[PDB]
Design a protein around this ligand. Structure first.
Ligand code: CL
Ligand code: CL
Ligand code: KR
Ligand code: KR
Length: 162
């Protein structure tokens, strides 16, 4: 397993615009198009992202390309965030994948707000962090996914994903 497979499991793959868990226009492997309620808006951003007139539909290859860019950007965002970087650099490879997952889902900003959880992770107090991480909107809104990522920081293995 790795970050790509992990996220492909959590996000799914849809080739037509769809609404995510928050009701936002998305396509592909969890590629958020816009927070606006306008479908036209969404179509416009899609076309812009892909470079053609898509008419709200994309190919598998195009979804994968957006996915690669999105992972890449998620990593670079962590490395660029003064609050995130130190934590991320202190983690083992498995746990780093979990941190990327969170960033991809809620943004760097969003993650950067888990102050207490971050320090616990940095200190390697796994169970404690796991408990603190679940005390969140994130966890109450998408509990199964949250549980998978949480177990991953807890154990440092991919068990949640097998
Ligand atoms: Cl884009
Ligand atoms: Cl979920
Ligand atoms: Kr992180
Ligand atoms: Kr976190």
């Amino acid at each position: 397993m790795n970050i790509f497979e992990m996220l492909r499991i959590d996000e799914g793959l849809r080739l037509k615009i769809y609404k995510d868990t928050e009701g936002y226009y998305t396509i592909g492997i969890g590629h958020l198009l816009t927070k606006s309620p306008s479908l036209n808006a969404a179509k416009s951003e899609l076309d812009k992202a892909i470079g053609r007139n898509t008419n709200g539909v994309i190919t598998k290859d195009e979804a994968e390309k957006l996915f690669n860019q999105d992972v890449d950007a998620a990593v670079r965002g962590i490395l660029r965030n003064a609050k995130l970087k130190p934590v991320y650099d202190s983690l083992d490879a498995v746990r780093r994948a979990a941190a990327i997952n969170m960033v991809f889902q809620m943004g760097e900003t969003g993650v950067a707000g888990f102050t207490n959880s971050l320090r616990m992770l940095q200190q390697k107090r796994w169970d404690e962090a796991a408990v603190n991480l679940a005390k969140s909107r994130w966890y109450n809104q998408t509990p199964n996914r949250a549980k998978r990522v949480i177990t991953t920081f807890r154990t440092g293995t991919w068990d949640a994903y097998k």
